[PDB]
Short mmCIF file of C-alpha atoms in Angstrom, two decimals:
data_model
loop_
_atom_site.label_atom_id
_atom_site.label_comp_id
_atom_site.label_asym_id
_atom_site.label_seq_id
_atom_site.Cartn_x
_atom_site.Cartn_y
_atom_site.Cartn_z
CA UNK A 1 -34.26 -27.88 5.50
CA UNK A 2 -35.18 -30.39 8.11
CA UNK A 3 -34.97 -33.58 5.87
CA UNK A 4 -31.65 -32.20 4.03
CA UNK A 5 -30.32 -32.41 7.78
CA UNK A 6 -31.55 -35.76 8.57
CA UNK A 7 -29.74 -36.97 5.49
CA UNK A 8 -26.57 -35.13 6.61
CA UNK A 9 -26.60 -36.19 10.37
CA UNK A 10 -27.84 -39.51 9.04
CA UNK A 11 -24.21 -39.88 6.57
CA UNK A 12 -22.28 -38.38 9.56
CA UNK A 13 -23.27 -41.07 11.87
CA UNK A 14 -22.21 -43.47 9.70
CA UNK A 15 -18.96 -42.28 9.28
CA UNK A 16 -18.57 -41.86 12.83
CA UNK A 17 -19.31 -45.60 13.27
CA UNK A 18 -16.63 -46.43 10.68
CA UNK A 19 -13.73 -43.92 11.64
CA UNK A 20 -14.49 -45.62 15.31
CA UNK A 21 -14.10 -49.59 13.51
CA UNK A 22 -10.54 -48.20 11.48
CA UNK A 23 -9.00 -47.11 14.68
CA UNK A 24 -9.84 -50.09 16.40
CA UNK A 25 -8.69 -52.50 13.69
CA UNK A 26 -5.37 -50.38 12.76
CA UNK A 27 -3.24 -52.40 10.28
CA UNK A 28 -0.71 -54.98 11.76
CA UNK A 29 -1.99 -54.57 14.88
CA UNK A 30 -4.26 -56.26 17.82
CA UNK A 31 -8.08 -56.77 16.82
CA UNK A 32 -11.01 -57.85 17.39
CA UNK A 33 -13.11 -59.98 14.99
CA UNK A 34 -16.08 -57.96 14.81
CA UNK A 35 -16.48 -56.63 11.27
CA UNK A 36 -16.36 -53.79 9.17
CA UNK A 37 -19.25 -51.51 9.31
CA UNK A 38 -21.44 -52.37 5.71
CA UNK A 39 -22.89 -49.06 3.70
CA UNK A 40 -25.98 -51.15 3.48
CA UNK A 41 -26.89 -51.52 6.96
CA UNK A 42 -27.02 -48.27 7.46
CA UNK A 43 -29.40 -47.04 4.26
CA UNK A 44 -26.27 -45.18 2.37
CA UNK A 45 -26.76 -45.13 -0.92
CA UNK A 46 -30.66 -43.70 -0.59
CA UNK A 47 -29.35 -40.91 1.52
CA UNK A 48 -26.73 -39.72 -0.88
CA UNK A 49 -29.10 -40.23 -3.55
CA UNK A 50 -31.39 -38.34 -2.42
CA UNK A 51 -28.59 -35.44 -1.42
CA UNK A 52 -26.96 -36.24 -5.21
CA UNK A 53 -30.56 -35.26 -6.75
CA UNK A 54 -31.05 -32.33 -4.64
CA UNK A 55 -27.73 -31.09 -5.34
CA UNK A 56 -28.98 -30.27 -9.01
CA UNK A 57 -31.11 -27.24 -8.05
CA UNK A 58 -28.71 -23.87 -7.08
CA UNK A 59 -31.57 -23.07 -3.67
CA UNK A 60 -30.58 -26.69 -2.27
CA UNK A 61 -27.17 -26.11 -2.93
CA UNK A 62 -27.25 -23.36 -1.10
CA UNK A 63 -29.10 -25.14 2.07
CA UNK A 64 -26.63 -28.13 1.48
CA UNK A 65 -23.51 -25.53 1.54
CA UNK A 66 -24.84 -24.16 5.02
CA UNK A 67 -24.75 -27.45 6.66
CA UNK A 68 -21.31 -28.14 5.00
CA UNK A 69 -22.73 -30.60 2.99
CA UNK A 70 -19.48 -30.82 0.69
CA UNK A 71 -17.78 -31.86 3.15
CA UNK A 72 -20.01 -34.94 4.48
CA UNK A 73 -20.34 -36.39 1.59
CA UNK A 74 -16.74 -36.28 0.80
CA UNK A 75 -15.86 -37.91 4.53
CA UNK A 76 -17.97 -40.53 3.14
CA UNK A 77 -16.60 -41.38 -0.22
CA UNK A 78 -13.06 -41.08 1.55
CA UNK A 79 -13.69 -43.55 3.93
CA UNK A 80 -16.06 -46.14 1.87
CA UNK A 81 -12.66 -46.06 -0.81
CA UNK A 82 -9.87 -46.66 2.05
CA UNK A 83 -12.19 -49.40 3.82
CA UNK A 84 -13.46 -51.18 1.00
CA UNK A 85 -11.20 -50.65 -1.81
CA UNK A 86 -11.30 -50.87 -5.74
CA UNK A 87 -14.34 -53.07 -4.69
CA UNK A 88 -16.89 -54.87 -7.77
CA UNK A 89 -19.80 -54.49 -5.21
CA UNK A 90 -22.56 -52.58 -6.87
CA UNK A 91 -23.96 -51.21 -3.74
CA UNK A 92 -20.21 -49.52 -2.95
CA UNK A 93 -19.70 -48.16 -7.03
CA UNK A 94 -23.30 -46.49 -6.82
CA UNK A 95 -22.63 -44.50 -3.51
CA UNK A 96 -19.34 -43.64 -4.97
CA UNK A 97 -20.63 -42.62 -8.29
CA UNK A 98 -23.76 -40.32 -6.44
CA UNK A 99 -21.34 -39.15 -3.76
CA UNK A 100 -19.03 -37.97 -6.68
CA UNK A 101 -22.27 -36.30 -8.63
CA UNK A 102 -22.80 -34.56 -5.74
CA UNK A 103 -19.28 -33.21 -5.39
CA UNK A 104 -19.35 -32.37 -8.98
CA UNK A 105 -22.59 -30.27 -8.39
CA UNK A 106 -21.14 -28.38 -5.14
CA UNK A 107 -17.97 -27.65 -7.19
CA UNK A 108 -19.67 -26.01 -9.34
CA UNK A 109 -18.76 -22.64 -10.22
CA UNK A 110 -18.51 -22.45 -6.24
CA UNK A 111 -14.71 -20.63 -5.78
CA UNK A 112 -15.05 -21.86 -2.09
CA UNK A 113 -16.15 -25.45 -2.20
CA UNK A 114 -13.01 -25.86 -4.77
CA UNK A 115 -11.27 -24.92 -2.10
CA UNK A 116 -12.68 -27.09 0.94
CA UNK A 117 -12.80 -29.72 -1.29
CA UNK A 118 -8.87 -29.90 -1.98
CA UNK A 119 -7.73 -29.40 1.63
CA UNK A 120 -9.22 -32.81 2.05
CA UNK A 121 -6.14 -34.64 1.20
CA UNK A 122 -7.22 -38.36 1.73
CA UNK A 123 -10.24 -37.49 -0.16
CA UNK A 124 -8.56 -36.30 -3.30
CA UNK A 125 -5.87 -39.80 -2.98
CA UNK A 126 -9.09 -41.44 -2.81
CA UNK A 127 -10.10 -39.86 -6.05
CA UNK A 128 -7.58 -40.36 -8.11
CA UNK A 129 -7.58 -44.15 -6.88
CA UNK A 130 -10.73 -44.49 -7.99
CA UNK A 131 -9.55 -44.04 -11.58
CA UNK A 132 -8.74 -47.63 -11.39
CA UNK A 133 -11.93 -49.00 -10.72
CA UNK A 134 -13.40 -51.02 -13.19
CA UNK A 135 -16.08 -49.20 -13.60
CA UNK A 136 -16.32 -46.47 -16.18
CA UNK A 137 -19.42 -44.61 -14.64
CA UNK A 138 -17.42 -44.08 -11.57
CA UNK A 139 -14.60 -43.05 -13.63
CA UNK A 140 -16.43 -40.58 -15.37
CA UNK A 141 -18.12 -39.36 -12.41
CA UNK A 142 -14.21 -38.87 -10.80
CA UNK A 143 -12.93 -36.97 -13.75
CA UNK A 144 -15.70 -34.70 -13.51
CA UNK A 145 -14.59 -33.67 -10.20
CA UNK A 146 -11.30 -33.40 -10.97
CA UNK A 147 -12.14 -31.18 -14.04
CA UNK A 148 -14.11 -28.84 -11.97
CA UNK A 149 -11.08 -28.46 -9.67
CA UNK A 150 -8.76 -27.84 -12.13
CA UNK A 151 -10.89 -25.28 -13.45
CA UNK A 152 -9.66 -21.56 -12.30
CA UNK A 153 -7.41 -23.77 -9.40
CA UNK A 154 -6.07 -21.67 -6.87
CA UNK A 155 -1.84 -21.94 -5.61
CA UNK A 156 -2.88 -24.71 -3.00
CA UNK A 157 -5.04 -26.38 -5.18
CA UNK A 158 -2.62 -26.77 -8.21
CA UNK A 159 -0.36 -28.04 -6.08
CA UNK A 160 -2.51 -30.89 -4.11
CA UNK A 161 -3.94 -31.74 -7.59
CA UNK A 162 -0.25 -32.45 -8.68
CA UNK A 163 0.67 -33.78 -5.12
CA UNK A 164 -1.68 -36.62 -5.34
CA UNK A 165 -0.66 -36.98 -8.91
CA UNK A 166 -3.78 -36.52 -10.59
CA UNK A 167 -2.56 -35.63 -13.87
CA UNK A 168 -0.59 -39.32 -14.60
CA UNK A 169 -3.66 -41.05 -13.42
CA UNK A 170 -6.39 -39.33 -15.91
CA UNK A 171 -3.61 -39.48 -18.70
CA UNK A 172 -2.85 -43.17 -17.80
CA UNK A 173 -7.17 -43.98 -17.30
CA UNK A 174 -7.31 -42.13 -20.74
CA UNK A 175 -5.28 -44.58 -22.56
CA UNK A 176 -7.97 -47.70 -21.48
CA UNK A 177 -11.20 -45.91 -21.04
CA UNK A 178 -13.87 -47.87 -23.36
CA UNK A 179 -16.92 -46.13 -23.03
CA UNK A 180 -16.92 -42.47 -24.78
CA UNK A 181 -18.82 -40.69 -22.33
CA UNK A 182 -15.83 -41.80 -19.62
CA UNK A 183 -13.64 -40.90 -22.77
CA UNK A 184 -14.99 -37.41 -22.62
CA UNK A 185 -14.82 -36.38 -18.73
CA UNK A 186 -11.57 -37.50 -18.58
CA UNK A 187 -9.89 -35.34 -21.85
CA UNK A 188 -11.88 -32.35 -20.32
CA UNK A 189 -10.29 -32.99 -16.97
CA UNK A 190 -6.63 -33.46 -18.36
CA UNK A 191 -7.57 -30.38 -21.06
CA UNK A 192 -7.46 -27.81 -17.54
CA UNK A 193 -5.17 -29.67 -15.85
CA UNK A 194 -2.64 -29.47 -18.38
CA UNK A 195 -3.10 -25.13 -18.81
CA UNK A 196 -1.70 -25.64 -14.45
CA UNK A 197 2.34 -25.31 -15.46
CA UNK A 198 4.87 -27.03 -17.19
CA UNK A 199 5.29 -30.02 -15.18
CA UNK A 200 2.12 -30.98 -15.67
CA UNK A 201 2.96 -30.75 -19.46
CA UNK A 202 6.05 -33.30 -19.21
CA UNK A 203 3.17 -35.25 -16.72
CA UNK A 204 1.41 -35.72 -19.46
CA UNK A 205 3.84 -36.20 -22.10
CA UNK A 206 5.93 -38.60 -20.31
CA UNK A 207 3.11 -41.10 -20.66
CA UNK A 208 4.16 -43.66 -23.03
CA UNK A 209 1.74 -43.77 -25.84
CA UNK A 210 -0.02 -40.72 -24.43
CA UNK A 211 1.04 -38.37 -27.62
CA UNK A 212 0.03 -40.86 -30.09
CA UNK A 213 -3.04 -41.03 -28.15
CA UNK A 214 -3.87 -37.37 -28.61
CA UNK A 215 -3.15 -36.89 -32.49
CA UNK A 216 -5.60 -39.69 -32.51
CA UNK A 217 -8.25 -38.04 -30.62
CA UNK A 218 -7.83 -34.65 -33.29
CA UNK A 219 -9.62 -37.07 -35.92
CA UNK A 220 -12.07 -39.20 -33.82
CA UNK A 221 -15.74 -39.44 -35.08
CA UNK A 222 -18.02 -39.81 -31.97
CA UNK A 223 -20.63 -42.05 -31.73
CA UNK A 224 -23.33 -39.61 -31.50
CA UNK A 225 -21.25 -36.71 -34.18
CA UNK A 226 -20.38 -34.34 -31.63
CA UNK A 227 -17.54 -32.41 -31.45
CA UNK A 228 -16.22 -33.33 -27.73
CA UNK A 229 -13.71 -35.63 -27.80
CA UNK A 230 -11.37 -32.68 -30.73
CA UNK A 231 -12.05 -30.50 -28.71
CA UNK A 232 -10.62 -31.73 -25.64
CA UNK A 233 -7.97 -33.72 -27.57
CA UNK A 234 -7.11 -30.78 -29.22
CA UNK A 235 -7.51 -28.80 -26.26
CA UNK A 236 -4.26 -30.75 -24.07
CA UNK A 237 -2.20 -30.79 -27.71
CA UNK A 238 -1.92 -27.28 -27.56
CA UNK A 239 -1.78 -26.59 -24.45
CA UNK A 240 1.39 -29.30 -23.96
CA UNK A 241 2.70 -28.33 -27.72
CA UNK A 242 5.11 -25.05 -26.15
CA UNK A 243 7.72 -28.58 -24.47
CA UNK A 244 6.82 -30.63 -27.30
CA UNK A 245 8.12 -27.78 -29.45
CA UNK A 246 11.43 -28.16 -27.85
CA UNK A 247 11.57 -32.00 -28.03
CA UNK A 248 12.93 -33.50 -31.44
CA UNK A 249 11.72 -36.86 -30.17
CA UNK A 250 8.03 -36.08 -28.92
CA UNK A 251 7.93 -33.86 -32.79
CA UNK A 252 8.67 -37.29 -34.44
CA UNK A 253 5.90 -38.87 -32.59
CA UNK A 254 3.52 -36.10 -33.85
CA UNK A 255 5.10 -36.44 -37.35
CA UNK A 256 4.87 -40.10 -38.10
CA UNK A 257 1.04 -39.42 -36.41
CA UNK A 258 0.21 -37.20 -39.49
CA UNK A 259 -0.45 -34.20 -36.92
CA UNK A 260 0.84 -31.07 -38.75
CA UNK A 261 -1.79 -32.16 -41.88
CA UNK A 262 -4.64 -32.67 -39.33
CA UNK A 263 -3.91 -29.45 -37.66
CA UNK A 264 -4.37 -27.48 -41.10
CA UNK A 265 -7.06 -29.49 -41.52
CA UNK A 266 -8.59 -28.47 -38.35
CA UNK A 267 -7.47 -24.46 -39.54
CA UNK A 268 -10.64 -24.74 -42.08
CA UNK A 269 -12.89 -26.15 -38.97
CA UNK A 270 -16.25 -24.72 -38.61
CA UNK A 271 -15.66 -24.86 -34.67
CA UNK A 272 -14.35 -21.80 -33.17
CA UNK A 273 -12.88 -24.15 -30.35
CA UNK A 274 -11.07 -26.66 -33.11
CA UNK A 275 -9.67 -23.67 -34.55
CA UNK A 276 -8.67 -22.18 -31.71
CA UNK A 277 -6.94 -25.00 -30.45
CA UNK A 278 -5.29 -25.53 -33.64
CA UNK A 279 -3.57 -22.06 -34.27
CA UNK A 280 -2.42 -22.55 -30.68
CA UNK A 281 -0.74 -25.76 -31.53
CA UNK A 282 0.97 -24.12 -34.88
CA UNK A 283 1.83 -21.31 -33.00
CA UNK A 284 4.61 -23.49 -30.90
CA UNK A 285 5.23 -26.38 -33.53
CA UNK A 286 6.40 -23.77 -36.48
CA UNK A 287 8.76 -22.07 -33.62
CA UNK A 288 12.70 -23.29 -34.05
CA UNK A 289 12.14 -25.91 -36.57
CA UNK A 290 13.39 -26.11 -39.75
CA UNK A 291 11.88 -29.61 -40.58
CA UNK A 292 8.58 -28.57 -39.72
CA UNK A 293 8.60 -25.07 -41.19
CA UNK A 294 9.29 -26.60 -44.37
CA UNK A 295 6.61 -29.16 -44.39
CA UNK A 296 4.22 -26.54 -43.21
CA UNK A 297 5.30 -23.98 -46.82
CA UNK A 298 5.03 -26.93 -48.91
CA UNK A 299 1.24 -28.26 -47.25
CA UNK A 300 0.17 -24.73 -47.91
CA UNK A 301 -0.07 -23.40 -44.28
CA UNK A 302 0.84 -19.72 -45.53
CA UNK A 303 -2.35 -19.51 -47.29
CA UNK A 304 -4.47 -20.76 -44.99
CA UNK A 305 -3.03 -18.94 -41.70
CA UNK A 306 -3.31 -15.34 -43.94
CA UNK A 307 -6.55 -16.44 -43.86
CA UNK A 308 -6.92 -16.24 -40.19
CA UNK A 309 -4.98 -13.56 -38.97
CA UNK A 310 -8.15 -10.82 -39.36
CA UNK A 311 -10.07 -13.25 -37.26
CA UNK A 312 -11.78 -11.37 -34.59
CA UNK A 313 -11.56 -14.07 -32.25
CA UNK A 314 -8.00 -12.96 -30.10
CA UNK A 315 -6.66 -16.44 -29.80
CA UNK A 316 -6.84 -17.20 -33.48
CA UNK A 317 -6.03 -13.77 -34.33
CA UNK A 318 -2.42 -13.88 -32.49
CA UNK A 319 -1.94 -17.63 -32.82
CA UNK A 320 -2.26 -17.54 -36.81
CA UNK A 321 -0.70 -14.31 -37.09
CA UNK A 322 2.37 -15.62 -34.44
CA UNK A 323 2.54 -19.04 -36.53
CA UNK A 324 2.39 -16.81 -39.71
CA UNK A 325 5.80 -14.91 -38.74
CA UNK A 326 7.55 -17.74 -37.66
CA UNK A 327 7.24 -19.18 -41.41
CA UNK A 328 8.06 -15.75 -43.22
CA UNK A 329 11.18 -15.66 -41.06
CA UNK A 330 12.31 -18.99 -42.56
CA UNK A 331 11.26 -19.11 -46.31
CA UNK A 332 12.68 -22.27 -47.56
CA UNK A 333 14.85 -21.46 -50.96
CA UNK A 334 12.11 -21.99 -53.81
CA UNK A 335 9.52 -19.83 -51.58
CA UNK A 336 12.38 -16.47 -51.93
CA UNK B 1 -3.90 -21.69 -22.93
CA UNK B 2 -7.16 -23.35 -23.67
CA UNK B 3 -9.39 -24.98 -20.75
CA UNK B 4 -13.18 -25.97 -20.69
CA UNK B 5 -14.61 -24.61 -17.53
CA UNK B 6 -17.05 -26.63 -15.22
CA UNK B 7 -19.41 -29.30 -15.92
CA UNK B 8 -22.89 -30.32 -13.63
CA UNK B 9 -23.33 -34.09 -12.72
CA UNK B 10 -24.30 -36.26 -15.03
#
């Protein structure tokens, strides 16, 4: 894997040459004139293109993962973002945006690499800040990272994901993203994020706008008529309904967003995910609630969840039949 | 909970 190496040592170097430049030009303090070390000078990008399009087949993963790879490539990103910034320049967006493919394809179902890759603490702030750039294909490629992290996310790893708080960021990107392919990596990044723990719930819900937002996404058409962007919509709704169940004002934001009609709209969905999704959602928002108990007998919810509860599909199974018993135990008067 | 797994590059 001679050439693999060359890259490696070759993207090593070069970070050498700039952690050498950042101590010697601390902040506030006595410098030189002599500048920054440039990306460009030094035939970046290629390299971690190169690395970004080997990184797509499992055997040169596997190569890459002996020379620690992973963590090369994310020295690199980590120091291009604190030296240069939320830069415009193309050259620095594309080696962020391969550097981040290639972290996306390490992460991978890799258990381990999850791991490395959050113990790198100024590489996941870096991350997150890059959320702000103004460009959307390095957002996307960001939130993909983060959504393979947050996927099966180990004690340490839930917690620096919520340390460097990721989950405001993608929430807060979420609300201005443009482009629906960013749109999509960064739902599906908040959607396993938000399963973490509670706080990440509020996180999310806190976000002014933010539950608005997500009713919205339940009826989006996509571009190209997929599926993606319910899903993943859907996907964070239920998983943050069980605190907006408890919250009289974040239930009036879902009510005067049409959500409860969408939801048992979503109940007759051909997509096992929508569904899903959706009897999780009723399964917390007819809980404890007398308003929306009533408005879910008289929209004709009974029917339609006794339609669901011999699903054999477990999640729509117990969330139907769980959303089901809630109602029975509050009949409003003319249902007796 | 609901979640989505991993995604490749791209």
């Amino acid at each position: 894997h001679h050439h693999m190496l060359h890259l490696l040592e070759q993207i090593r170097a070069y970070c050498e040459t700039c952690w050498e430049w950042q101590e010697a030009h601390e902040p506030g303090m006595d410098q030189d004139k002599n500048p920054m070390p440039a990306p460009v000078e030094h035939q970046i990008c290629p390299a971690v293109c190169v690395l970004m399009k080997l990184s797509f087949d499992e055997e040169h993963r596997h190569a890459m993962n002996e020379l620690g790879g992973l963590q090369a490539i994310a020295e690199l990103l980590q120091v291009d973002c604190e030296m240069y910034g939320l830069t415009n320049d193309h050259y620095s967006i594309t080696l962020r945006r391969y550097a981040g493919m290639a972290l996306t394809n390490l992460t991978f179902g890799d258990v381990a690499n999850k791991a490395t890759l959050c113990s790198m603490k100024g590489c996941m702030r870096a991350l997150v800040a890059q959320l702000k750039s103004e460009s959307e294909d390095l957002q996307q490629v960001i939130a993909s990272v983060l959504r393979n992290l947050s996927w099966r996310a180990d004690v340490n790893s839930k917690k620096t994901l919520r340390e460097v708080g990721s989950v405001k960021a993608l929430m807060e990107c979420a609300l201005e993203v443009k482009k629906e392919s960013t749109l999509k990596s960064v739902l599906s990044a908040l959607w396993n994020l938000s399963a973490h723990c509670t706080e990440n719930k509020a996180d999310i819900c806190a976000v002014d706008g933010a539950l608005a937002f997500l009713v919205g996404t339940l009826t989006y058409r996509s571009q190209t008529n997929t599926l993606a962007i319910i899903e993943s919509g859907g996907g964070i709704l239920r998983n943050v309904s069980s605190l907006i169940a408890t919250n009289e004002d974040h239930r009036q934001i879902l009510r005067e967003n049409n959500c409860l009609q969408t939801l048992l709209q979503h109940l007759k969905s051909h997509s096992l995910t929508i569904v899903s999704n959706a009897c999780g959602t009723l399964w917390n928002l007819s809980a404890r609630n007398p308003k929306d108990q009533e408005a879910l007998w008289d929209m004709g919810a009974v029917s339609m969840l006794k339609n669901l509860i011999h699903s054999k599909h477990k999640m729509i199974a117990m969330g139907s039949a769980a959303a089901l018993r809630n109602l029975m135990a509050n009949r409003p008067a003319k249902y007796k | 909970l609901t979640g989505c797994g991993d995604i490749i590059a791209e």
